[PDB]
Amino acid sequence: ATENPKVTLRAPFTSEEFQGALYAIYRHIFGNTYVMESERPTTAESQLKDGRITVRGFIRLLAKSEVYKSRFFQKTSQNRFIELSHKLLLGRAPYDQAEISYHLDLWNTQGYDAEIDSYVDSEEYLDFFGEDTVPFLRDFKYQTGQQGVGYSRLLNLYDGYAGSDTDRAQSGQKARLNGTIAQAEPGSIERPSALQDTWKFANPNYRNAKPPMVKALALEPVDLL
Amino acid sequence: MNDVFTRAIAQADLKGSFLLESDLDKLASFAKEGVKRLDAVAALTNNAPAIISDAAHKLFAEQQELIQPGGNAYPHRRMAACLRDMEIILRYVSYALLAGDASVLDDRCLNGLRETYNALGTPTQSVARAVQLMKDAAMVHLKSTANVTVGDCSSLYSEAATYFDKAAASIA
Amino acid sequence: MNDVFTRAIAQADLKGSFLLESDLDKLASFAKEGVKRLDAVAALTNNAPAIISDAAHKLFAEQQELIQPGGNAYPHRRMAACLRDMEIILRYVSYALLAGDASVLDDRCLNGLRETYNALGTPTQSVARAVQLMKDAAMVHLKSTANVTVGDCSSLYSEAATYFDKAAASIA
Amino acid sequence: MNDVFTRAIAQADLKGSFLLESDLDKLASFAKEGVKRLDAVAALTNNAPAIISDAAHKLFAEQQELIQPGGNAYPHRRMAACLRDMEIILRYVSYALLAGDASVLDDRCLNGLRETYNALGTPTQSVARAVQLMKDAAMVHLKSTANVTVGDCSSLYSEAATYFDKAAASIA
Amino acid sequence: SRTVITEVIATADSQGRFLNSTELQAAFGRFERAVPAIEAARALTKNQDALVKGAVQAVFKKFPYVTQPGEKGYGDSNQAKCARDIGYYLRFITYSLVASGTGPLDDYVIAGLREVNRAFNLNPLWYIEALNYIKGETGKLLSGQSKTEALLYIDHAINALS
Amino acid sequence: SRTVITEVIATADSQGRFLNSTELQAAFGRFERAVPAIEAARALTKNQDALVKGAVQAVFKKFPYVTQPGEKGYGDSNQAKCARDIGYYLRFITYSLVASGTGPLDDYVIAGLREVNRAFNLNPLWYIEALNYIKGETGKLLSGQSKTEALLYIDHAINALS
Amino acid sequence: SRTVITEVIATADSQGRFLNSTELQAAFGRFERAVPAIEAARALTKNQDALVKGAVQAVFKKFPYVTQPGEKGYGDSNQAKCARDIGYYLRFITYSLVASGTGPLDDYVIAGLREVNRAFNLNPLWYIEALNYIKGETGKLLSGQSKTEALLYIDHAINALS
Amino acid sequence: SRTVITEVIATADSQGRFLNSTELQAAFGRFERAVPAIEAARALTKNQDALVKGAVQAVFKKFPYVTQPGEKGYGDSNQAKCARDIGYYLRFITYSLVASGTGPLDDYVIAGLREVNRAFNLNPLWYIEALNYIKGETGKLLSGQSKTEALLYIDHAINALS
Amino acid sequence: MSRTVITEVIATADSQGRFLNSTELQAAFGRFERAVPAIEAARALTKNQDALVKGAVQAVFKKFPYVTQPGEKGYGDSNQAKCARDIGYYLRFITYSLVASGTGPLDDYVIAGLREVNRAFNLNPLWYIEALNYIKGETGKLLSGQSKTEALLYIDHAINALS
Amino acid sequence: RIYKITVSEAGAYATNKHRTGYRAPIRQSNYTLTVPYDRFLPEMIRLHQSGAKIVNVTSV
Ligand SMILES: CCC1=C(C)/C(=C/C2=NC(=C\c3[nH]c(/C=C4\NC(=O)[C@H](C)[C@H]4CC)c(C)c3CCC(=O)O)/C(CCC(=O)O)=C2C)NC1=O
Ligand SMILES: CCC1=C(C)/C(=C/C2=NC(=C\c3[nH]c(/C=C4\NC(=O)[C@H](C)[C@H]4CC)c(C)c3CCC(=O)O)/C(CCC(=O)O)=C2C)NC1=O
Ligand SMILES: CCC1=C(C)/C(=C/C2=NC(=C\c3[nH]c(/C=C4\NC(=O)[C@H](C)[C@H]4CC)c(C)c3CCC(=O)O)/C(CCC(=O)O)=C2C)NC1=O
Ligand SMILES: CCC1=C(C)/C(=C/C2=NC(=C\c3[nH]c(/C=C4\NC(=O)[C@H](C)[C@H]4CC)c(C)c3CCC(=O)O)/C(CCC(=O)O)=C2C)NC1=O
Ligand SMILES: CCC1=C(C)/C(=C/C2=NC(=C\c3[nH]c(/C=C4\NC(=O)[C@H](C)[C@H]4CC)c(C)c3CCC(=O)O)/C(CCC(=O)O)=C2C)NC1=O
Ligand SMILES: CCC1=C(C)/C(=C/C2=NC(=C\c3[nH]c(/C=C4\NC(=O)[C@H](C)[C@H]4CC)c(C)c3CCC(=O)O)/C(CCC(=O)O)=C2C)NC1=O
Ligand SMILES: CCC1=C(C)/C(=C/C2=NC(=C\c3[nH]c(/C=C4\NC(=O)[C@H](C)[C@H]4CC)c(C)c3CCC(=O)O)/C(CCC(=O)O)=C2C)NC1=O
Ligand SMILES: CCC1=C(C)/C(=C/C2=NC(=C\c3[nH]c(/C=C4\NC(=O)[C@H](C)[C@H]4CC)c(C)c3CCC(=O)O)/C(CCC(=O)O)=C2C)NC1=O
Ligand SMILES: CCC1=C(C)/C(=C/C2=NC(=C\c3[nH]c(/C=C4\NC(=O)[C@H](C)[C@H]4CC)c(C)c3CCC(=O)O)/C(CCC(=O)O)=C2C)NC1=O
Ligand SMILES: CCC1=C(C)/C(=C/C2=NC(=C\c3[nH]c(/C=C4\NC(=O)[C@H](C)[C@H]4CC)c(C)c3CCC(=O)O)/C(CCC(=O)O)=C2C)NC1=O
């Protein structure tokens, strides 16, 4: 949300900016999942370095690659794929059931690449990331078109800094917002276990009243006077 | 995604051993009946609109409450969603039939489908009935003798029924 | 992510107070010994491949079940992920040794790590073992008196040990 | 980007031989006046709003055709763009001052700023006059000996005026 | 906060690499400049009462039209809040000096500054005048590198106000 | 893994469509090639021990220095690990032959090969020599299309290691 | 290239802001550290030839099989290539010392290093041992802080190779 | 134009890798299945005129109302357009047979089908009945695997219409 | 969800993160003024629904006399009765769209998924187009003035969706 | 086929950025976009909605 800077890469750039930008791109678009050296796309980043494609075109190529499909598409329900795609390509969570219906129909009709295009050719992607900056999780700060459920739902989709969106869990790759979006509910705000040691002396509920052990009763003038 | 071959390989790798001769002969069988499997898959693919149409007609003759106002297949949006789901389930059944393994259906189509349908408000019993009707319609085309050399395909019929039954049981 | 200075500042802010004289003295002490801290960070950074190699060798000598077919580090993919994990934990321990506060570990390195390991089925005991092995291998390079001025750097050794222990305890 | 040290390294690498004693002596002198360079950069930074405001006031008093309706800086948005352009040019100039190389200013900005100003319809001599007024305003703050120890920085003034006039001539 | 150590570590992490020479030299510079910075923080902390009351008085002199009834400065509560605000600014300046980075100033004063001032109709020129007075008094309380450090952070706050 | 049937179903799935004639034609080619492929897998599984021992011996002939004291091939545990590794490669080549694709190799050897070899300082050239010996010997065995099927996967492994 | 000053300027430009306390403190650390670094660069430029000759011979003692006919180190041309490569590394170490940043080593050696060595079958351990020898004589040649600077840049190179 | 070879090339190009065992076996299956599809292409190209006229008559029989005036079938121009459209369908089905792929149909008929049928009011059941006629004819003009090829491509075109 | 004037007003102001300015109040005002014609039109169409539905069924039969032949869709009593059901659906969704003063109800209930259901059940859009043209003709008799224009705007939106 | 579009960002786009703001960093006005045929219509209509003015569209 705050500490990591927004990685931007214009067409003229030096070596360290390029290498760091690719590190950030792979650490975001591919979940937090490890991408082995046999999976790194060399032609795609040659095209990025030359300036044939922007960062947005590179993101499109990466989301259409089989690293992305194998992790987030081929072992998933479409609900999970849509959740992940929103998180990883728009930086937010699905707001409505209408988005899931729209994207499911779009994939069923026109196939996977048109779906990735709708994610990356959207006016919201261009508003927040344009062509130069890597996507980032953006619903942890209030932006103009946010909705009340976005914070909770993204926080539900975000598993911490050391978590990842891996298909290699023993439970597999499962949708976690498939029920909350249909009911139009918020998301779960239960954070990892490593964090119950942070700022334990804060007292947000300071105004809360402790109840008495027994309620005050009036035997004569009635009981609630 | 797994087929019979990759499934046998993964099982063998789990114990860190080569593929036994028994496994190789089973896979050689599967390969030899591969052509019958291909004809089964083609029958499912090519007759899909007819399968789904017959299934829809039967289902919405039995269950009027779906297509009434307040039913879950009432407006064109919901009815289109119904037919779309039926075609997607049939598609994944055919994928699994070609694969010889049911893992694609479980991983993709049925992963959390019951929770999805419960969330949306869909009668999962009606979805299971639609899948059973699709199975009944599909067996008719799977057994079509025309346009193919005569032979034995009883195992393939049992396998297709197995994948349809898996889908129906997982949904409801 | 805080350093020692920002931690002191946050406490002073909560009190609404300027930093007391004794607080400024403890901070001037920390910065006055900062050169030894930088040398210890350089020792950790420069020898990191050696530390990870030695920890890995000892860990897989002790626990052969990790590298047997069916173990959690069996194929190349899992072994590469394991080595990356050791790399990452050493990286963050060096970050914490530079800052002087173990907030970087719980904020970043150990944020959701235990949940990750549970969901993947990684034996957290073996991970904590790997961290202890890295701690032991790192202490050798931290005490290395070659190329540096002789001096008392026991506070640094204890602090680094506590960072390694905080990791191995948060995973386990 | 590129620095004076980086520039010298690049020239040495083009001929593929070690940096000569004369080059090392010049770079040592640069590092010796680095403290003065830091003061000059801090002087530019700490009074940047004052520099912008003085340059803008003098420019708009000089050229009222920009203020009046139909001018290139008439509405609030065009005024704000004017001020933002002055600010970014100053920021790049201070970058060049700190690095000692004009690359940070020449690379990203001045190459396309020509086409941008031509397309938008801005009077280019007006923008060059704005940058020159910025230089004139900034020299006073660079000279201000208050709060800094008395010393000679004629090289720094020459280099800063060089960067200012270079940007103004580029946009011109 | 965005102190030298923290920004070093954060940029190192965002690139997935250890701390190299560049970062260690930056940290070394920070640990060396600690001495003038801690000295400036001591000087300002010892003299916080005189500094803040003088700043409030300087504001009331450069803005005479504020003290009269009918506007912001009239009333004991409003002047108490004036002194409290300048005490806040000076506190966070000393925090920046101790931390050797504008992180405390940024996080605690600059983020949300304009919106808060607009909402409560607090003129930034008031705090600019108070900080200018504090800059003047630190010119006398401090010498050498301590003065440069303190003035650097005070000017950062002023530029953020204007 | 990525075997012919799996790319077939995967492309159909990603495009949201049924399996068309092209997909079934690729599957039919797969089912034809299953015969020499499983024959080759049978032959390699039968002769695994001799192939492994010969490959280890070839490695030690090509890189004699490896077995000197203090070198990676010194001792019995190191050479047993050598034998285990060559058996691994042979196992996964037979798996790839059976599954008609490089999915088993890609997923259990190539994914992570370079990082692992670099961390433990294992020279890929050793495995190149071992796989070259396995190639030469599977030339003697495996007449026909079985030979070509085997060499395709042996070459995939060798090309990965380089 | 990655220097201290360039990291300063890029971090300032990326956030669209001016240079400030943290960044000027990093630059001040650079300017303070320049003296040992320029001194080490001078001392290493004096003794380039002896260092390179010793490093080449060190590799040849450590990997005696390399000099054997049919191997990489056999032939005067290959040994001239070896000396040229060690000279390359030493030159970029001196550049990095002058720049107070690993930017030169990064850009001119490390970027592309693994793929190039893989393509030409250049064992990184050769260059690691040669850099170890250079590290050894840096202790004799340099003392003080120039010693530490040279050693940390050499260790950066060795970490990149290993 | 998606074919077996085209998908072969597209996958390996997207992954940035050489063509390997998997898609080579896919291309092999395509090459083997070429000859029955090729001679089925021979068969449909030979008998094109009779098939087109018969399909036109079958359509005008199943939809008698189209013939009478005020409908789409009235007129020699509309009749020639019917024959032309059915000939287009047959030509592209033969193209799919010779190409061993659905690509020709997808590119030349299926893409933009529903939009222009809605715009020109061309009922898809007309062409569905024509294609069912041609299905009946290819049932007798072809035997063996070529019958299956023609039937798969024809009924794929039907499904695209339905 | 539904695209009423008010809803798009609010959605536009919300996407821009601003309050409702004078322009949007103008739009709302105009909608509130067109409410009266729309509501009286919906009332007139609701009273006269039975003749509309029966006449639409008859017109579809007349224009396509072959659908009542055996083996065709119109054959059977159930098919025709629930054809009357479909026409009633279209009619009351048109009334909904009139009342809402926006085509939202049509786009949401009939138009979304119209083509796919028509295909899957092999139903000619021309049948319903003929029925909606019959209603378009008869509404001129039922309605007069601006309410007539509103009704025909919505009926033709339905037709164009089918067209 | 691939189509290269040279778009010049003009006052129509500058007004939109002055109203909405810069949630993304400011960039030079003249840049070239490369599109496939499938994407040419959506990208070009999008550039129109953004207010950008295309200069030259070249095929390749
Ligand atoms: C914030 C810093 C950070 C950390 C700490 C981190 C840890 C991390 N380790 C992972 C996997 C793993 N981690 C291990 C390591 C364990 N298994 C072995 O037995 C050892 C005993 C032990 C290591 C010493 C293994 C084997 C995997 C792969 C699990 C699998 O492939 O099934 C993954 C899953 C990524 C993926 O596979 O796509 C993460 C996110 N990630 C981060 O971004
Ligand atoms: C690719 C794997 C996959 C599938 C197949 C899947 C199914 C799925 N079905 C959905 C809705 C639906 N599904 C149905 C179908 C059912 N309702 C009727 O009663 C029938 C009995 C029955 C069909 C035979 C209906 C009507 C809806 C819409 C319900 C609603 O809008 O609330 C949705 C939500 C999108 C929407 O609202 O249209 C999904 C995601 N999800 C997946 O990730
Ligand atoms: C579109 C609907 C919507 C709303 C309304 C919304 C509110 C919202 N308030 C937030 C933080 C906050 N909100 C408050 C407000 C509280 N402080 C005091 O206690 C008051 C009692 C109270 C306000 C009257 C504060 C202080 C924070 C900062 C807490 C923090 O960031 O740590 C955040 C976290 C992101 C950020 O810091 O900007 C959100 C998302 N989000 C939405 O999507
Ligand atoms: C382009 C895609 C493609 C298809 C469609 C295809 C079909 C195909 N079907 C075949 C035969 C066959 N097909 C069947 C299946 C039939 N047996 C029963 O009648 C069932 C009703 C029915 C199953 C649906 C059988 C039994 C054979 C003979 C194989 C044998 O007896 O071993 C053969 C072997 C040669 C022949 O006998 O003609 C092929 C290649 N090949 C392809 O590359
Ligand atoms: C399933 C895929 C897979 C492969 C391929 C694999 C290879 C592999 N071999 C290893 C050890 C080793 N492997 C060798 C092989 C050498 N021995 C010498 O005699 C020969 C010259 C040479 C072989 C030709 C050696 C020496 C070691 C010990 C390295 C060490 O202890 O650092 C290790 C390090 C961990 C261990 O097992 O102790 C791996 C990961 N591991 C896997 O999970
Ligand atoms: C480029 C980055 C950089 C580094 C790495 C750096 C290290 C550094 N090490 C130093 C000496 C030292 N280094 C150490 C640390 C060592 N003492 C040994 O016994 C222990 C094994 C070990 C840790 C306890 C000590 C104790 C001193 C002398 C005491 C002191 O300088 O305060 C000094 C002070 C110079 C002196 O007074 O002689 C520096 C600046 N400086 C830099 O600018
Ligand atoms: C079309 C949109 C537009 C507006 C609204 C606008 C206002 C405006 N007035 C200005 C000058 C000024 N405006 C004032 C206004 C003050 N004078 C006092 O009598 C009053 C208390 C108070 C007015 C209520 C003053 C004192 C100045 C001179 C100081 C300065 O801003 O440079 C300036 C600075 C540059 C200039 O001289 O134009 C602007 C931008 N300019 C525009 O292009
Ligand atoms: C790499 C750094 C960089 C620079 C330097 C840059 C300059 C720049 N100036 C612009 C407009 C402008 N620039 C100016 C400024 C000039 N016009 C005159 O009035 C003034 C005397 C003079 C200021 C000294 C003005 C007034 C506009 C508005 C033109 C318009 O809106 O039509 C624009 C168009 C974008 C927009 O208006 O929102 C750019 C891109 N952009 C960058 O990314
Ligand atoms: C926190 C950020 C930071 C700053 C701001 C900084 C400035 C700085 N200025 C200095 C003195 C100086 N400053 C200047 C520059 C001034 N002399 C003339 O008056 C010019 C008008 C003017 C230049 C614009 C000079 C010439 C010296 C003395 C250097 C010398 O000749 O020895 C010194 C050395 C003081 C000493 O050790 O005796 C420093 C460190 N260093 C930092 O780390
Ligand atoms: C959103 C409002 C809505 C509409 C518009 C709608 C129409 C509609 N008509 C249907 C069936 C049908 N529709 C017809 C067509 C009619 N039958 C003949 O009397 C006429 C000639 C002809 C109309 C002019 C027929 C014959 C069927 C049943 C057989 C079939 O289509 O396969 C179906 C499929 C399920 C069912 O049997 O009810 C729908 C969804 N349903 C809705 O919920």
DSSP code per residue over chain F:
--BHHHHHHHHHHHTT----HHHHHHHHHHHHHHHHHHHHHHHHHHTHHHHHHHHHHHHHHH-GGGGSTTSTT-SHHHHHHHHHHHHHHHHHHHHHHHHTBSHHHIIIIITTHHHHHHHTT--HHHHHHHHHHHHHHHHHS--THHHHHHHHHHHHHHHHH-
Around ligand 7, the residues with Cβ closer than 6 Å are D 57, 60, 67, 74-76, 79
Q: Rounded to whole angstroms, how far apart are CA atoms I95 and I105? A: 9
Q: Is E111 helix (H, G, I), strand (E, B) or coil?
A: coil
For residue J42, the chain A residues in CB contact (below 8 A) are 117, 121
C146 Cβ below 6 A of ligand 6 = no
Residue E132 structure tokens: 């200018």
Nearest to G26 by CA among G7, G41, G40: G7
- E53-72 CB burial, b ≥16 within 10 A, e <16: ebbbebbbeebeebbeeeeb
Nearest to D29 by CA among G35, G15, G147, J37: G35
Whether G162 contacts chain C with CB within 8 A: yes
Query: Contact, J9 vs J30, CB < 8 A?
Result: yes
Given a contact as 3+ CB pairs under 8 Å, which chains touch J? A, D
Residue F76 structure tokens: 């019995």
Q: Rounded to whole angstroms, how far apart are CA atoms I29 and I31? A: 5
- Side chain identity at residue E139, one-letter code: G
Q: Rounded to whole angstroms, how far apart are CA atoms E115 and E119? A: 6
One-character DSSP codes across I74-127: T-SHHHHHHHHHHHHHHHHHHHHHHHHTSSHHHIIIIITTHHHHHHHTT--HHH
Q: Rounded to whole angstroms, how far apart are CA atoms A222 and B16? A: 80
End-to-end CA distance of chain A: 51
Nearest to E62 by CA among E116, E123, E107: E123
Residue C83 CB contacts under 8 Å (≥ 6 apart), including other chains: C52, C56, F115, F116, F119
- Residue F108 has φ and ψ, to the nearest 5°, of -110, -5
Query: Contact, A170 vs C119, CB < 8 A?
Result: yes
Q: Rounded to whole angstroms, how far apart are CA atoms B17 and F45? A: 10
Query: Contact, C34 vs E27, CB < 8 A?
Result: yes
Query: Inter-chain contact D108–A10, Cβ cutoff 8 Å?
Result: yes
Nearest to F72 by CA among C85, G123, C75: G123
Query: Contact, I63 vs I37, CB < 8 A?
Result: no
Around ligand 3, the residues with Cβ closer than 6 Å are A 141-142, 146-148, 150-151
DSSP H helical segments within chain G, as ranges? Answer: 4-14, 21-46, 48-62, 76-99, 103-105, 113-120, 124-141, 145-161
Query: Contact, G26 vs G98, CB < 8 A?
Result: no
The DSSP element (H or E) to which C14 belongs, if any, is helix C4-15
Residue D65 structure tokens: 């055709």
- Side chain identity at residue G80, one-letter code: A
- D87-106 CB burial, b ≥16 within 10 A, e <16: bebbbbbbbbbbbbbbbbbb
State the Cα torsion H31-H32-H37-H43 to the nearest 10°. 110
Q: Rounded to whole angstroms, how far apart are CA atoms A11 and A20? A: 15
Alpha-carbon Rg for chain D, nearest whole angstrom, is 18
Alpha-carbon Rg for chain F, nearest whole angstrom, is 18
Nearest-Cα distance to chain G for A22, in Å, is 14
Closest ligand, as measured to the CA of J27 = 8
What is the experimental resolution, given in Å to one decimal place?
Answer: 2.8
Q: Rounded to whole angstroms, how far apart are CA atoms I154 and I96? A: 10
One-character DSSP codes across chain H: ---HHHHHHHHHHHTT----HHHHHHHHHHHHHHHHHHHHHHHHHHTHHHHHHHHHHHHHHH-GGGTSTTSTT-SHHHHHHHHHHHHHHHHHHHHHHHHTSSHHHIIIIITTHHHHHHHHT--HHHHHHHHHHHHHHHHHH--THHHHHHHHHHHHHHHHH-
- B105-118 CB burial, b ≥16 within 10 A, e <16: bbbbbbbbbbbbbb
Give A35-48 as a 3 state SS string: CCHHHCCHHHHHHH
Query: Contact, A96 vs A131, CB < 8 A?
Result: no
Query: Contact, B40 vs B153, CB < 8 A?
Result: yes
Whether B145 contacts chain H with CB within 8 A: no
Q: Rounded to whole angstroms, how far apart are CA atoms B81 and I116? A: 10
How do beta strands J2-8 and J53-59 pair?
A: antiparallel
* Half-sphere exposure in the Cβ direction for D18 (13 Å, CA): 21
Q: Mutating which of A3, A32, A142 best tests the E interface, going by the most E Cβ atoms within 10 A?
A: A3
Residue G63: left if φ>0, alpha if ψ -120 to 50, beta else—which one? beta
Whether H33 contacts chain F with CB within 8 A: yes
- Residue A95 has φ and ψ, to the nearest 5°, of -90, -30
Given a contact as 3+ CB pairs under 8 Å, which chains touch H? A, B, F, I
> Length of chain I, please?
163
Nearest to E96 by CA among E24, E160, E49: E160
Q: Rounded to whole angstroms, how far apart are CA atoms A59 and A30? A: 10
Query: Contact, E37 vs E138, CB < 8 A?
Result: no
- Side chain identity at residue G13, one-letter code: D
CA distances from E84 to E48, E80, E131 (A): 11, 6, 14
Residue entry with tokens 């000759």: G53
Query: Contact, E155 vs E138, CB < 8 A?
Result: no
Q: Is J7 helix (H, G, I), strand (E, B) or coil?
A: strand
Given a contact as 3+ CB pairs under 8 Å, which chains touch D? A, E, G, J
Query: Inter-chain contact I117–B52, Cβ cutoff 8 Å?
Result: no
Residue F105 structure tokens: 């190799």
Whether F29 contacts chain H with CB within 8 A: yes
Residue B83 structure tokens: 């037919």
Furthest CA-CA distance within chain E: 61
Is H touching G (3+ C-beta pairs, cut-off 8 A)? no
Nearest to G138 by CA among G42, G35, G51, G38: G51
Residue B19 structure tokens: 């593929």
Closest ligand, as measured to the CA of A76 = 2
Q: Rounded to whole angstroms, how far apart are CA atoms C44 and C58? A: 19
Q: Rounded to whole angstroms, how far apart are CA atoms I98 and B151? A: 62
**In angstroms, how far is CA B153 from the centroid of its own chain?**
17
CA distances from A74 to A34, F151, H134, H144 (A): 18, 30, 38, 36
- Residue J2 has φ and ψ, to the nearest 5°, of -100, 140
Q: Rounded to whole angstroms, how far apart are CA atoms F59 and F53? A: 10
**In angstroms, how far is CA I62 from the centroid of its own chain?**
22
Nearest-Cα distance to chain B for F6, in Å, is 7
Q: Rounded to whole angstroms, how far apart are CA atoms D44 and D142? A: 7
Query: Inter-chain contact B94–F19, Cβ cutoff 8 Å?
Result: yes
Query: Contact, F8 vs F19, CB < 8 A?
Result: yes
- Nearest residue of F to residue C81, measured between CA atoms: F112
Residue entry with tokens 């403190």: G25
Q: Rounded to whole angstroms, how far apart are CA atoms I159 and I127? A: 11
CA distances from H115 to H72, H111, H119, I115, I163 (A): 18, 9, 6, 11, 11
Angle at CA of residue H97, ends H93 and H100, nearest 5° = 130
Closest ligand, as measured to the CA of B32 = 4
Beta bridge partners of J53: J8
CA distances from C25 to C9, E48, H5 (A): 14, 19, 75
Nearest to E34 by CA among B54, A107, C37, H39: C37
Whether A144 contacts chain C with CB within 8 A: no
Is J touching C (3+ C-beta pairs, cut-off 8 A)? no
Q: Is D1 helix (H, G, I), strand (E, B) or coil?
A: coil
Q: Which atom of ligand 1 is nearest to the CA of C109?
A: 1
- E80-114 CB burial, b ≥16 within 10 A, e <16: eebbebbbbbbbbbbbbbbbbbbbbbbbbbbeebe
Query: Contact, G58 vs G35, CB < 8 A?
Result: no
Q: Which of 12-31 (A) contact G at CB < 8 A?
A: 14-17, 19
Whether E1 contacts chain D with CB within 8 A: no
Angle at CA of residue J28, ends J23 and J33, nearest 5° = 90
Q: Rounded to whole angstroms, how far apart are CA atoms A125 and A141? A: 16
Given A36, A38, A111, which is nearest F15 (Cβ)? A111
Query: Contact, C56 vs C73, CB < 8 A?
Result: no
Beta bridge partners of J7: J31, J54
Question: How far is the centre of ligand 5, averaged over its atoms, from the C-alpha of C150 (Å)?
Answer: 40
Alpha-carbon Rg for chain I, nearest whole angstrom, is 18
Q: Rounded to whole angstroms, how far apart are CA atoms I14 and A146? A: 9
Nearest to E86 by CA among E40, E132, E127: E127
Residue J33 CB neighbour total at 10 angstroms? 22
State the Cα torsion E69-E75-E81-E85 to the nearest 10°. 40
Nearest to A177 by CA among A88, A106, A86, A90: A86
Query: Inter-chain contact H15–A65, Cβ cutoff 8 Å?
Result: yes
Whether F148 contacts chain H with CB within 8 A: no
- Provide, for chain A, the percentages of residues in helix, strand and coil under a 3-state DSSP scheme, each rounded to the nearest 5: 45, 0, 55
Residue entry with tokens 């390991």: C117
Nearest to E96 by CA among C13, C99, G8: C13
Cβ-based interface (< 8 Å): residues of D facing J = 77, 80-81, 112-113, 115-116, 119-121
Residue I29 structure tokens: 């005002």
